[PDB]
Structure 1
Amino acid sequence: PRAKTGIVRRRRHKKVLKRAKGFWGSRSKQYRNAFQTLLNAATYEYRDRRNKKRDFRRLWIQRINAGARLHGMNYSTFINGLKRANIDLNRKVLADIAAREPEAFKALVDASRNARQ
């Protein structure tokens, strides 16, 4: 019995083409170039899934020592002094948000400045 490709190739192909969506030019309408684009897209995906966590670490750090310098401290100094004070163990995420609620971050700064004199 013969068993020609029939329905199968078109269906895998459409699966890739639908992954394409807003890909510029042939990247979204010709199969081979869509497939190949998605190879490099795999690369980018997995590695960024890692990276985003370095990213938000960086951003919270920026904001935290921005607030720390608002009061005459700095990230090195404020983070250490908080660490010295019965280990606060707030995440760097959480210290930022208290850089959206200044009256508290202030007291955290005075507390870090304490366990440090």
Structure 2
Amino acid sequence: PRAKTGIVRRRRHKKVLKRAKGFWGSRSKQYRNAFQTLLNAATYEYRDRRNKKRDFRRLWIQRINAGARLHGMNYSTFINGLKRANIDLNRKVLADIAAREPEAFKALVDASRNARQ
């Protein structure tokens, strides 16, 4: 028996078509192109997680020492210090502590020098 493709294809298409939103021109109105855009889309999506992890620790390390150096230390040093004090062990939120609580951050700062030399 004959067996069209009817409705079966329109849908497959609308699926992708609707994934494309602020996709510029053709890329968001033409199947083929819109779809194709989403292969490269794969590439970015997947690799961007394994990656924003890379990006974020960077934002953290940047701040952690623009405070570290705000007293006379610097990330490099500072970090090994809290390290020198197994006691200390944040690293995660450390930046924030250094961004919001200066009162605190100082503490940890001097705490390291006091476990350093």
Question: TM-score over 0.5 for the alignment?
Answer: yes
Once the two structures are superposed, residues 4-32 of structure 1 have per-residue CA deviations (whole angstroms, 9 ceiling, x without a partner) of 10111000000000001110010000000
Cα distance in 1 for partners of 2:95, 2:33 equals 46
Higher helix proportion, which one?
1
Question: Which deviates further from its counterpart, 4-13 or 94-103?
Answer: 94-103
CA contact (8 A) 1:57 1:92 kept: no
Paired residues, number: 117
CA contact (8 A) 2:64 2:94 kept: no
Cα distance in 2 for partners of 1:83, 1:22 equals 47
Contiguous gaps of at least 5 residues in structure 1: none
Question: Percent identity between the aligned chains?
Answer: 100
Residues 107 and 97 of structure 1: CA distance in aligned 2, closer, same or farther (over 3 Å): closer
CA contact (8 A) 2:63 2:98 kept: no
Cα distance in 1 for partners of 2:56, 2:93 equals 8
Q: Normalising by structure 2, report the TM-score.
A: 0.95
Cα distance in 1 for partners of 2:88, 2:80 equals 10
Cα distance in 2 for partners of 1:28, 1:95 equals 40
